[PDB]
Every structure is written in structure tokens, then in C-alpha cells.
Amino acid sequence: LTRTQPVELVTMVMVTDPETQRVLVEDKVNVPWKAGHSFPGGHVEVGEPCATAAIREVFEETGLRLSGVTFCGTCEWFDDDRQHRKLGLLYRASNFTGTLKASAEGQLSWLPITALTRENSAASLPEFLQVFTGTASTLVSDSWNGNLRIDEGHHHHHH
Amino acid sequence: LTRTQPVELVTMVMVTDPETQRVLVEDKVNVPWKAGHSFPGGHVEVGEPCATAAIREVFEETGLRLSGVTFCGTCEWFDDDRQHRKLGLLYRASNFTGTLKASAEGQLSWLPITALTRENSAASLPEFLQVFTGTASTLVSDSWNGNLRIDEGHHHHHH
Numbered sequence: 434l435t436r437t438q439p440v441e442l443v444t445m446v447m448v449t450d451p452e453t454q455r456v457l458v459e460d461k462v463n464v465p466w467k468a469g470h471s472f473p474g475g476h477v478e479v480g481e482p483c484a485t486a487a488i489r490e491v492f493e494e495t496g497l498r499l500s501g502v503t504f505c506g507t508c509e510w511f512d513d514d515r516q517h518r519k520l521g522l523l524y525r526a527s528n529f530t531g532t533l534k535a536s537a538e539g540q541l542s543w544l545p546i547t548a549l550t551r552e553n554s555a556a557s558l559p560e561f562l563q564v565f566t567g568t569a570s571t572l573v574s575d576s577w578n579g580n581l582r583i584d585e586g587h588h589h590h591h592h
Numbered sequence: 593l594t595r596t597q598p599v600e601l602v603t604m605v606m607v608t609d610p611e612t613q614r615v616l617v618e619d620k621v622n623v624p625w626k627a628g629h630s631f632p633g634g635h636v637e638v639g640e641p642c643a644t645a646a647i648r649e650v651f652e653e654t655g656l657r658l659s660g661v662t663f664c665g666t667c668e669w670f671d672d673d674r675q676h677r678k679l680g681l682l683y684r685a686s687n688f689t690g691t692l693k694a695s696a697e698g699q700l701s702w703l704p705i706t707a708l709t710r711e712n713s714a715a716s717l718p719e720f721l722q723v724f725t726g727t728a729s730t731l732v733s734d735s736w737n738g739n740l741r742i743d744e745g746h747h748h749h750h751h
Binding site: 434435436437438439440441442476477478479480481482483484485488489499500501502503504505506507509511515516517518520522524570571573583584585586587588590 | 593594595596597598599600601635636637638639640641642643644647648658659660661662663664665666668670674675676677679681683729730732742743744745746747749
């Protein structure tokens with residue numbers, strides 16, 4: 434406390450095409466246990482700002498050049514010991530230049546949000562959507578891969 | 593990378609009284625070099641979610657009981673080595689119960705936002721306001737106490 438603690442910083446971005454209102458999602462082939470739509474995102478480097486990391490990830494993975502990003506909210510995951518956490522910063526953006534990398538034809542797809550379901554998407558994508566669309570802004574999971582619920586101040590404050 | 597890094601997590605909350613539209617600020621006496629309006633906030637404990645920490649801080653310092661908080665954005669500060677960072681999560685809230693602690697009469701004040709100036713407030717408060725009011729959502733400073741500027745992806749990515 435009152436200085437640093439271990440945090441795994443990750444970003445996630447929902448890019449919207451202002452001309453069609455569709456959003457950009459990773460739509461790649463994979464083994465049955467990993468297949469599913471997912472939003473671009475990755476790890477924030479040490480020394481690297483979070484929003485900068487988000488813009489870089491989108492560029493490196495999709496080729497799109499975001500002029501900036503707008504913050505939507507956070508998702509937090511804790512292990513059993515809770516000595517560390519994964520902090521995901523979710524951003525949205527609709528202002529960009531460039532086009533999808535030819536290197537990712539059948540790897541990236543523009544889809545209406547309504548096309549995304551819990552069944553055809555990566556774990557917790559519906560929850561991420563709640564954050565991206567603005568219905569929620571602070572979700573937390575008590576397991577590194579558990580269910581994300583709204584954070585409203587409930588905790589073992591007396592410990 | 594690709595797991596944890598040292599991050600000093602801090603929260604800051606702008607509470608608005610829906611009946612007057614005024615915001616709650618710390619308005620305490622202090623030496624000349626520390627005096628100035630400031631928004632409540634503090635350090636996030638290990639194991640403790642960020643939004644939960646924000647709600648706790650407001651309760652412990654003001655007595656107000658927030659039913660929840662809405663994310664506004666982030667402020668990041670880096671030292672010269674950039675090996676660590678201070679990540680500030682800014683929230684806003686207008687739904688609460690309780691009243692100001694008698695323990696903080698001339699310590700807390702409800703003031704219209706227009707009453708806050710760079711001259712009568714703590715360092716970077718104008719920038720925090722930009723985030724709280726929604727004009728910006730991702731600010732970064734290249735010094736532990738420097739000027740907060742909008743994060744739009746500029747960095748030494750080639751290093």
C-alpha cells in the first residue's frame with residue numbers, strides 16, 4: 434500500500450465503424466476450447482501509458498490507426514490469494530485512419546453488436562459489452578477467470 | 593510484462609449533491625505550500641477492488657455512503673526511470689445516503705464547480721475536472737508531479 438503493488442495491466446478496445454455502426458472483433462479459427470469472438474487488446478508495457486498501449490495494440494493487431502481512445506471502465510480479476518490482480522482498462526473509439534491488415538482477412542470481422550452472444554464469444558464478452566456500451570463501468574471477479582459482477586463496495590473491509 | 597508490474601493505485605471521487613449541483617471538496621486549513629481545494633481519494637489496498645476502495649475512502653473521510661460510483665477516466669504519473677507508475681482512477685457519484693461527518697465541519701465544503709480555480713486548488717485539479725466532467729478521460733504526466741496531458745498514443749514505441 435501507499436506506493437506500489439503487483440498489477441497485471443491489460444487493455445481492451447471496442448472500435449466502431451461510424452459508417453456502419455459495426456464493431457471490430459477478432460474472429461479467428463482455433464481449437465474448440467478457445468474459439469469465440471473477442472475484442473482486440475493486450476498487455477501494457479512498463480513505462481508505457483495504458484491508453485497509449487491500447488492504441489498500439491489496435492494498430493499492431495488490426496492496422497487501424499486510432500486518433501485517440503475514450504475510457505469506458507475497468508474489469509478486475511483476483512486470484513485466490515488476492516496478492517495480485519489483473520486490471521483491464523476498456524476503451525472505445527470510432528475515429529481512425531487506415532484499413533484492416535491484409536494479414537488478417539478471415540481473422541478480423543466487422544459485426545453488429547447484436548451478433549455477439551455469450552455462446553459465440555470469448556469468456557465474459559457479454560460483461561465487457563456492458564462496460565463498452567455504458568450500462569456498467571466497474572466490474573470485478575473473485576477468480577482469475579470467474580464471473581464479472583458490478584463493484585458496489587462490498588468487501589471484507591474489517592480484515 | 594505479460595503478468596504484473598509495480599503500480600501505485602489511487603482513487604479520486606467527485607461527489608455531486610443532486611439537490612444543489614455542488615461538488616464535495618476537501619477545504620482544510622494547512623501550511624501555505626499545501627493549502628488548496630482537493631477531491632477526496634486515497635490508496636487502494638492489495639486484495640481490494642478499486643471502485644470499492646473509492647467508496648470506502650469517501651465514507652471514511654466524509655461519512656457519505658455512496659450506493660456506487662461511475663468511472664470517468666484515469667490519470668497516470670511516471671517517475672524518471674518509468675519503472676513504476678501511479679495510476680489514478682477517477683470516479684463520479686451523486687447517489688448516496690448519510691451526511692457530512694461532524695468531525696469535518698470546516699474541513700469539507702460543498703461548492704459549485706465554477707468556484708474551483710487552479711489558484712485555489714491542489715496541483716492538477718483543473719485537469720482532474722476535465723476528466724470528471726467528461727471533456728477528457730485519459731491523462732498522463734511524465735513526472736511524478738508534472739502536468740497532465742491527454743494520452744493519444746505518443747511514446748518511444750521503438751525502444
